[PDB]
Amino acid sequence: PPVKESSFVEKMKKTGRNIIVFYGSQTGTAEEFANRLSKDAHRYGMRGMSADPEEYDLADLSSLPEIDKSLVVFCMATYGEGDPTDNAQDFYDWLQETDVDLTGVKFAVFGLGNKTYEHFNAMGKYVDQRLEQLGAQRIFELGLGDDDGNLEEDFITWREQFWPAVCEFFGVEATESSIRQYELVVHEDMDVAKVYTGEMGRLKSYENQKPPFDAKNPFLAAVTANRKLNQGTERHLMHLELDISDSKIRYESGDHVAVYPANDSALVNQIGEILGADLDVIMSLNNLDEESNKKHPFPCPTTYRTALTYYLDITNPPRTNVLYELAQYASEPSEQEHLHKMASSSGEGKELYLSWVVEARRHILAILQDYPSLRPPIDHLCELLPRLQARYYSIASSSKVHPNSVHICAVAVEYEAKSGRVNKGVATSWLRAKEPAGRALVPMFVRKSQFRLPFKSTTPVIMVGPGTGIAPFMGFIQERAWLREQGKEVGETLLYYGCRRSDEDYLYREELARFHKDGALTQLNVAFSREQAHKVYVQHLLKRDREHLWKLIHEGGAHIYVCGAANMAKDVQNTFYDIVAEFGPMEHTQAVDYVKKLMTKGRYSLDVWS
Numbered sequence: 001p002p003v004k005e006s007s008f009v010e011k012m013k014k015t016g017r018n019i020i021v022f023y024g025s026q027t028g029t030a031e032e033f034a035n036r037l038s039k040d041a042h043r044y045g046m047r048g049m050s051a052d053p054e055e056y057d058l059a060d061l062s063s064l065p066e067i068d069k070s071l072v073v074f075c076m077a078t079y080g081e082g083d084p085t086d087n088a089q090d091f092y093d094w095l096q097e098t099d100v101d102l103t104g105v106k107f108a109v110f111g112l113g114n115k116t117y118e119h120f121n122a123m124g125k126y127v128d129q130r131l132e133q134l135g136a137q138r139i140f141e142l143g144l145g146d147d148d149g150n151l152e153e154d155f156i157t158w159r160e161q162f163w164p165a166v167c168e169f170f171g172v173e174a175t176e177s178s179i180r181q182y183e184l185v186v187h188e189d190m191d192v193a194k195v196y197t198g199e200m201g202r203l204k205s206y207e208n209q210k211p212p213f214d215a216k217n218p219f220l221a222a223v224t225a226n227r228k229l230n231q232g233t234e235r236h237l238m239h240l241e242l243d244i245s246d247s248k249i250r251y252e253s254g255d256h257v258a259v260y261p262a263n264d265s266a267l268v269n270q271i272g273e274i275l276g277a278d279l280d281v282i283m284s285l286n287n288l289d290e291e292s293n294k295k296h297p298f299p300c301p302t303t304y305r306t307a308l309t310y311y312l313d314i315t316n317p318p319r320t321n322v323l324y325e326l327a328q329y330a331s332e333p334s335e336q337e338h339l340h341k342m343a344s345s346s347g348e349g350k351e352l353y354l355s356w357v358v359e360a361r362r363h364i365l366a367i368l369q370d371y372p373s374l375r376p377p378i379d380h381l382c383e384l385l386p387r388l389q390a391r392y393y394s395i396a397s398s399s400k401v402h403p404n405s406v407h408i409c410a411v412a413v414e415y416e417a418k419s420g421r422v423n424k425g426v427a428t429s430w431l432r433a434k435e436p437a438g439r440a441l442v443p444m445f446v447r448k449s450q451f452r453l454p455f456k457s458t459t460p461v462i463m464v465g466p467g468t469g470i471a472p473f474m475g476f477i478q479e480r481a482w483l484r485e486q487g488k489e490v491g492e493t494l495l496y497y498g499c500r501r502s503d504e505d506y507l508y509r510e511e512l513a514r515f516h517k518d519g520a521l522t523q524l525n526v527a528f529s530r531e532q533a534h535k536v537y538v539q540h541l542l543k544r545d546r547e548h549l550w551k552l553i554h555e556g557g558a559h560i561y562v563c564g565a566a567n568m569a570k571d572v573q574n575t576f577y578d579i580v581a582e583f584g585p586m587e588h589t590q591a592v593d594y595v596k597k598l599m600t601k602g603r604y605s606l607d608v609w610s
């Protein structure tokens, strides 16, 4: 519970703003859109601002009508089980319990979601419906951006109709030109001590480690083990062990660990080199809006090298607004036109953006090379690029067995992009290079989750996790094996695992063998998808054991667990539908419902990513 800021409406009256855009973001996307809509206001004769709903008290909404033509927009993303982002929790809870009258309040909502999840854009739908219930009036249709297809285009399309509608309603009109959020200040005699070198929180935070640790103050865990898990060479699957000794950090199997990686130093040098810039200049980007709490786009003062290395996203396909602001720096007319046309909501521009940038997975350097006429000043490129995000990983260990260590199970990302070059995953390439024992350190923190073992050690457990999904279950199994070692009475523990071949990527083959032999694993059912002509998937095994699984489900009150990358989860879900439908019996419909009831009742947990 942080100390809230004073009334945002009052802050709006002072700074002469009529529109405010809050963001429910966790990975930074929502925030990105919020900031974009906020600036937009200016091109329509209005002034706006974006804000973190956590730092404010949304009850002040009822005072928004005090401002003429005032308007409020919410860019909210959803997380696991249609839940709000951590930073939208206060607002969510408030909407639930409040009875405040929002008469005269004009609002609009854009939801960031992903059609593959159960509760698609639940947060958005809820905010949009709740505000109308409290008596506020919708000024524009609810937006349903789908990250499965292309969220960016969903935002453009929505946005392209949003502003005209706002103008129409408030009787305003168009006016643009390039505007910078920050101002460059080159520091010359800057004492080193006052220069950020990659820390996230306070100056020298990574060196002077003082608890508690978290996203703002990550703990640098030393890598004590980094081994290759797969036997073959098709891909690289590694096992890392981070030592959290004296971190006073607690965790449970099923939780996630987040890490702050470093971009590929050569990729960084090249961006600098090709821009003809000196990545070693010490500078600061100071907000030209002396009112905003966001003093800088990222920790300052610091160097461009450090910025591009630890604070900036330099590998993900740039969004239309970035390519739009950059077109101004392409001396070649044709290249300026393409970059400029990227933000179209249809036609050749949209197509070009979709295939040549997105489908092509062209990162910022690639575009600079494939458009040699584009040479933006380094300082402006840093204001435009998004913030490098922490990457999450399901802890592959139990604290009951490994309280001072956090395990990670991951497959290094490296692929051939249609863009012509070989793209490398940021966090994984970085993790792969971490050699134990010059102490390989990894800035990280733990995030609690709702993917947990059952409370009663007797409850049956069904773990479905193909490929790397086997990650959280390695901790589950250790812990369960541990419960049997501690004389506790443990119910059946079944693992439904999958890989291509037992001689290629059969993860933890030995360990898993140990547990089965010692009885920790009641069943070790493994589906090798490529050892025969047809695919043998984990769900094929669930179908095979329908009779038994049903007995554990319907009578043993067993808990179902699904992990993996993200199509797979759906298949597994339908298999459970058909299992229940045949053994109930019952229609497909009452089956889907049965399995759905199990999810709400906490007996079917999901942990799928990307």
Ligand SMILES: Cc1cc2nc3c(=O)[nH]c(=O)nc-3n(C[C@H](O)[C@H](O)[C@H](O)COP(=O)(O)OP(=O)(O)OC[C@H]3O[C@@H](n4cnc5c(N)ncnc54)[C@H](O)[C@@H]3O)c2cc1C
Binding pocket: 256, 315, 361, 391, 392, 393, 394, 395, 409, 410, 411, 412, 413, 415, 416, 424, 425, 426, 427, 428, 429, 468, 471, 608, 609, 610
């Ligand atoms: C909750 C949660 C738990 C997770 N748990 C784990 C885990 O336990 N183990 C694990 O291995 N991962 C896990 N992840 C995934 C992890 O967070 C990262 O997404 C993954 O490690 C890749 O990150 P990176 O920085 O290495 O690569 P990035 O730089 O993040 O690149 C990732 C992007 O590469 C692109 N890409 C990948 N392959 C291709 C391709 N061949 N063609 C075109 N584009 C492609 C995709 O857009 C993908 O999003 C989890 C994710 C979440 C959210």
Ligand SMILES: Cc1cc2nc3c(=O)[nH]c(=O)nc-3n(C[C@H](O)[C@H](O)[C@H](O)COP(=O)(O)O)c2cc1C
Binding pocket: 024, 025, 026, 027, 028, 029, 030, 031, 077, 078, 079, 080, 081, 082, 083, 085, 112, 113, 114, 115, 117, 118, 119, 120, 121, 122, 147, 151, 609, 610
């Ligand atoms: C762990 C996790 C859980 C998610 N759960 C949901 C969900 O329940 N419903 C949904 O529509 N989208 C879900 N998504 C997708 C996000 O809503 C979507 O990627 C959004 O663009 C993220 O925005 P942000 O970067 O601003 O947080 C999830 C993503 C992750 C990583």
Ligand SMILES: Nc1ncnc2c1ncn2[C@@H]1O[C@H](CO)[C@@H](O)[C@H]1OP(=O)(O)O
Binding pocket: 466, 467, 468, 498, 499, 500, 527, 528, 529, 530, 535, 537, 538, 539, 567, 568, 571
């Ligand atoms: N739809 C699906 N359902 C269950 N497993 C799947 C799946 N699609 C792929 N897999 C398997 O997930 C495992 C880890 O990536 C691999 O064995 C992969 O098999 P495949 O690669 O031969 O299709």
